Design a protein around this ligand. Structure first.
Ligand code: P9X
Lengths: 228, 233, 293, 57, 340
């Protein structure tokens, strides 16, 4: 009150101005959508990023669509332990996962016994059933589907899945893959998985992402009222 | 480089009006408070008006209350001073001063190069009894300033400022809050005091220290300057 | 014989069925509403941690309902003694202002909640859906000011006037001058009903068009949205219907002959407890029957 | 022979920490106790100060 | 594959003789001697200030040497300098990368540092002839995220990284003067000795190492923990340090005895330690936990002497002023509290 000198009052006014600027920046940040991009290096993250946007560390990509501002965060460059920094992304709107369909017959360079598809399944299981993402929806992308159609004839799907008992029909194999991936999650009530099939689709990927984000945002809005 | 350039002034008839403006460059204008300081042709400094960062706070001297108005244009980095009903006692050199306020900052650190205005035809009292101290190079000289009211505050700060005005130059800040050296000031200067009696000590006197020394209080809003003490070689 | 002149010609009736029917149901309403509203109140003030833009409106609804409930042990003694007000003169006009203010405030705060849910469901990306707690407070203050301004004229009126050895404390009497209070009674039900119906139909239409119906919590939200409209209509329709009947009788037969309003007056005063029962019913629909509380 | 260099470096490092001298645990315990006793009166946390000289009063 | 097996066996015997020497030099236990001293009373510290303005989780804080100013880093992409006496905000520095994990304040008070998932340590000059804070230097050597950084002086800074390495930097030239490469896991924390000639680092391989700043070599290695070490701090004397890990225990190590001295654990505490610090005299050991509260330990008797409660989320950082007057805690609930 009146017990402050002139310089003290001026410092208080400066602090108030800083507070106003901080609140404005916080509101501007809160008006925007955060997404985490995960997957294998060759699984098709780069083509997804290129479709959305039409050295080491963390790579941010910013794009707009129907007046909504998105920013994707790519953490593929961090080779360190994932559990020490994965808690920093708690609170993202959704997680985008990319899996290459043409990986069912390929194997990793490090281990020939360890095929790429099972490694992708292990990573998906670890990410989905995580203590930090128990309420975060996952957008799943299956990219190399024309190559999948080409390779489903010469190389049967039974190579990756010994217990597969279906025909070599393309949509049947795709349905089997999607069902196998969608069965890793153990919440089934707090988490929903959106699966889409994209090879070179134009603006279909962005529209699908926008629809999934709107569906997540509606259910988040219904949390504030309390009727959800 | 930091630069403050004022423009305007000249010759004004009594009772007329005129606006002075100051253009700033080389620093973040919108983060600083700004002051107008006056200089009579033979007398000392006299505070006029102040505007804070964000224009939230504005203060005026008693003699210019109502007649003068002060405004700032942040996007253009320009400060304004509109004067109305000018009197014969308004003739002076008008300086523009920048000041920033936070813990450990140095207010009144940079002064502009003022412009001459010519017109045709309670408060803390700061006293500098000595008006002339003839000196010789290499000698240690002390300059004393005393205040009617105690400048010590309950927070442990003593709001006393020392300034130096070389011949044909704008005033320069030397000591802020009674003990702290300004960034460019050499270490030969030293400040001390206790509440009411204050002193500035110059050691290993050079030939560039010839000028008028002023003491200022920053405790109460009507900032007041003591009559300067001139050093002659 | 039943004619009276409070300030104009106005029939007034004293009936025996009121003493039999109103005290029990009104006491049950009072106790249940007091319990529920107080419980929700001290859960809100203590157990909650973070306050959002919708819980502020819900808390305003709770305090309005609590204020309406706490001020009706005194009209129990005006019903058990036929029509007899022994509490004075100020405690009549003051509580009439209380009731006519809290009822409208409660209706406004159901409308606000309905509009909020509409904007959060149908327009997910909108500035209204993200507003700080400092704007909800000022909106609440403005709405309270609106309801107080619309109710304030009830504080200056000629209350306890002797008719046959008893004093009357009732702003709902069968007169003919078109008092503004009856217009407010009709207007506080017509427009809010339309707003609620529109904002409810659009929510289910959007939730069905976007195909969230397979989710169980979406179905629970849909049914708890239908419950609000059903409760509002069943609590506020009969009073308006009987008032319209009374107005039609006044326009056709005229006020020259009383004793033709004997049944409609009793029906209106019996059904007017449904508005009070609404304040008892809505705390559990809005507060307790939610996944988070 | 890519990792032979780092294995030999590890062996050399272990040889370096092998020759480092050690003292008794009791001496270190006494040193820590003496340090804690000497500066006991200078710790404002275990010896609360009056509100006259408390900056956060 | 023959010489490698011989070298591994030689290392096994080297570790065996190190263990034997450590057992031989362990004549008594610090708990055995200390039992005769009088215990400290119950510690009743109450909140004195609450600093608000961060809109996301707070990850790091650091006190100034004047014991009045402090800097805090949060995920909202802002670096705030506080005046703890008046709760005034002195500066607000917007970071280029909002994924900050650490922050440091220079002893002279002229510079501040921060870093995180960008693998870059940024230096900000707080005292410019202008009225703003601007970036002075950026260090881009590490190939992993930066977990800790501490100023040696105005021109030297030491950083720890997720690439299992620690480095000493020259700020003027922006170059790596020295590199430390002993660890086999992610380095999570480091502490500077009072004389600033040695420093200790704790990594995810459940080990701590004592480094020589000048020679750039590992002097000693300390074991005993079972999980990743998240925090480390020297005893005020400089001859000991304390580590906190994910196995819900804190331990004290002696440099001269090359072994553990005490263990600070309770059977009903099962969450990991996030931060640890000492009091001015070294008698009190303050540790932040995942269970939303800090525990004050008697560093000489390993008995809990107080509790700091009042945070609604995980306590991520804490520090004690250089004069020992106050303790500050930061939490994931976006609030900073000053205790006394
Ligand atoms: C019947 C009435 C009443 C009854 C007894 C005492 C006061 C008021 O209840 C309403 C009301 O709450 O709106 C108006 C009334 O006249």
């Amino acid at each position: 009150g009146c017990t402050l000198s002139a310089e003290d009052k001026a410092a208080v006014e400066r602090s108030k101005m800083i507070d106003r600027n901080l609140r404005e920046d916080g509101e501007k940040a809160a008006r925007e959508v955060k997404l985490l991009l995960l997957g294998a290096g060759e699984s098709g993250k780069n083509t997804i990023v290129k479709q959305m946007k039409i050295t080491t560390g963390i790579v941010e990509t910013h794009f707009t669509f129907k007046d909504l501002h998105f920013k994707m965060f790519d953490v593929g460059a961090q080779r360190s332990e994932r559990k020490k920094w994965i808690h920093c992304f708690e609170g993202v709107t959704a997680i985008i996962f990319c899996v290459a369909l043409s990986d069912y017959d390929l194997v990793l360079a490090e281990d020939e016994e360890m095929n790429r598809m099972h490694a992708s399944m292990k990573l998906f299981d670890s990410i989905c059933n995580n203590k930090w993402f128990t309420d975060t929806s996952i957008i799943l992308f299956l990219n190399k589907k024309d190559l999948f159609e080409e390779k489903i004839k010469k190389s049967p799907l039974t190579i990756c899945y010994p217990e597969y008992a279906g025909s070599n029909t393309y949509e049947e194999a795709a349905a089997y893959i999607q069902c196998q991936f969608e069965d890793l999650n153990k919440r089934k009530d707090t988490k929903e998985i959106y699966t889409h099939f994209t090879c070179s689709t134009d603006t279909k990927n962005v529209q699908f992402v926008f629809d999934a984000v709107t569906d997540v945002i509606i259910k988040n809005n219904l949390k504030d009222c309390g009727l959800f | 480089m930091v630069q403050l350039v004022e423009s305007g002034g000249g010759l004004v008839q009594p009772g007329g009006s005129r606006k002075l403006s100051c253009s700033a460059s080389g620093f973040a204008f919108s983060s600083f408070g700004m002051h107008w300081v006056r200089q009579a042709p033979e007398k000392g400094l006299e505070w006029v008006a102040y505007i804070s960062s964000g224009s939230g706070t504005i203060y005026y001297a008693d003699t210019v209350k109502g007649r003068f108005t002060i405004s700032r244009d942040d996007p253009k980095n320009t400060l304004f001073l509109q004067m109305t009903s000018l009197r014969s006692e308004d003739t002076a050199m008008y300086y523009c001063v920048r000041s920033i306020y936070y813990y450990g900052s140095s207010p009144f650190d940079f002064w502009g190069q003022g412009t001459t205005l010519t017109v045709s035809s309670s408060d803390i009292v700061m006293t500098q009894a000595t008006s002339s101290v003839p000196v010789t190079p290499g000698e240690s000289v002390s300059i004393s300033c005393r205040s009617s009211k105690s400048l010590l505050h309950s927070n442990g700060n003593t709001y006393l400022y020392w300034f130096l005005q070389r011949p044909g130059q704008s005033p320069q800040l030397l000591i802020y809050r009674m003990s702290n050296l300004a960034s460019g000031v050499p270490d030969r200067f030293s400040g001390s005091g206790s509440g009411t009696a204050f002193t500035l000590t110059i050691s290993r006197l050079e030939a560039e220290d010839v000028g008028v020394y002023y003491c200022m209080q920053h405790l109460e809003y009507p900032l007041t300057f003591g009559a300067g003490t001139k050093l002659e070689l | 014989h039943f004619l009276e002149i409070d300030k104009k010609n106005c029939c007034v009736f004293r009936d025996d069925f009121i003493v039999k029917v109103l005290p029990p149901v009104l006491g049950l309403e009072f106790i249940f509403g007091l319990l529920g509203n107080g419980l929700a109140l001290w859960i809100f003030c203590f157990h909650l941690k973070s306050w959002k833009s919708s819980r502020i409106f819900l808390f305003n609804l709770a305090v309005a309902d609590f204020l309406l409930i706490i001020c009706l042990p005194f009209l129990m003694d005006n019903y058990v003694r036929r029509w007899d007000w022994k509490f004075g003169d100020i405690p009549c006009r003051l509580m009439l202002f209380m009731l006519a203010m809290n009822r409208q405030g409660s209706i406004i705060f159901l409308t606000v909640v309905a509009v909020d849910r509409y904007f959060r469901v149908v327009h997910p990306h909108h500035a209204l859906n993200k507003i700080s707690n400092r704007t909800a407070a000022i909106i609440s203050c403005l709405l309270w000011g609106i309801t107080i301004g619309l109710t304030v004229h009830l504080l200056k009126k000629k209350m306890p006037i002797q008719n046959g050895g008893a004093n009357l404390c009732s702003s709902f009497s069968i007169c003919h001058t078109f008092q503004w209070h009856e217009a407010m009674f009709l207007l506080e039900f017509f427009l809010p009903l339309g707003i609620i119906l529109f904002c409810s139909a659009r929510i289910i239409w959007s939730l069905r068009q976007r195909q969230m119906d397979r989710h169980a919590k979406i179905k629970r939200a849909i049914t708890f949205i239908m419950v609000v409209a059903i409760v509002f209509v069943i609590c506020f329709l009969p009073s308006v219907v009987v008032r319209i009947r009374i107005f039609w009788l006044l326009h056709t037969s005229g006020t020259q002959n009383c004793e033709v309003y004997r049944s409609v007056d009793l029906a209106f005063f019996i059904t007017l407890s449904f508005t009070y029962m609404n304040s008892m019913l809505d705390p559990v629909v809005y507060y307790f029957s939610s996944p988070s509380f | 022979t890519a990792s032979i260099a780092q294995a030999r470096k590890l062996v050399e490092q272990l040889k370096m920490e092998a020759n480092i001298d050690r003292i008794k645990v009791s001496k270190a315990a006494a040193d820590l106790m003496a340090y804690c006793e000497a500066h006991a009166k200078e710790d404002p946390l275990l010896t609360p100060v009056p509100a006259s000289e408390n900056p956060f009063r | 594959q023959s010489e490698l097996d011989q070298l591994r066996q030689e290392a096994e015997q080297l570790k065996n003789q190190i263990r034997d020497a450590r057992k031989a030099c362990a004549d008594a236990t610090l708990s055995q001697i200390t039992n005769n001293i009088d215990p400290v009373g119950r510690i009743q510290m109450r909140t004195r200030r609450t600093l608000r303005g961060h809109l996301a989780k707070i990850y790091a804080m650091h006190w100034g040497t004047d014991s009045r100013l402090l800097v805090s880093a949060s995920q909202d992409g802002k670096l705030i300098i506080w005046d703890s006496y008046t709760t005034n905000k002195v500066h607000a520095i917007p970071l280029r990368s909002s994924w900050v994990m650490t922050c440091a304040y220079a002893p002279s008070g002229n510079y501040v540092a921060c870093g995180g998932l960008d693998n870059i340590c940024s230096i900000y000059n707080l005292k410019t002839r202008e009225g703003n804070v601007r970036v002075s230097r950026e260090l881009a050597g590490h190939t992993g995220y930066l977990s800790c950084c501490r100023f040696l002086d105005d021109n030297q800074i030491v950083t720890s990284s997720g690439d299992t390495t620690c480095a000493l930097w020259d700020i003027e030239t922006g170059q790596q003067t020295t590199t430390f490469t002993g660890h086999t896991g992610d380095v999570m924390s480091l502490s500077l000795a009072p004389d600033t000639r040695l420093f200790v680092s704790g990594a995810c391989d459940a080990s701590a190492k004592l480094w020589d700043v000048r020679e750039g070599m590992c002097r000693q290695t300390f074991t005993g923990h079972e999980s990743d070490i998240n925090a480390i701090c020297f005893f005020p004397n400089g001859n000991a340090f304390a580590t906190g890990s994910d196995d819900a225990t804190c331990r004290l190590f002696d440099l001269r005895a090359d072994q553990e001295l005490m263990t600070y654990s309770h059977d009903n505490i099962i969450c990991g330690i996030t931060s640890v610090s000492f009091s001015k005299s070294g008698r009190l050991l303050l540790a932040g936990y995942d269970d939303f509260n800090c525990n004050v330990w008697d560093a000489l008797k390993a008995d809990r002497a107080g509790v700091l409660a009042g945070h609604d989320n995980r306590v991520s950082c804490l520090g004690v002023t250089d004069d020992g007057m106050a303790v500050a805690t930061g939490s994931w609930d976006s609030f900073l509290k000053i205790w006394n």
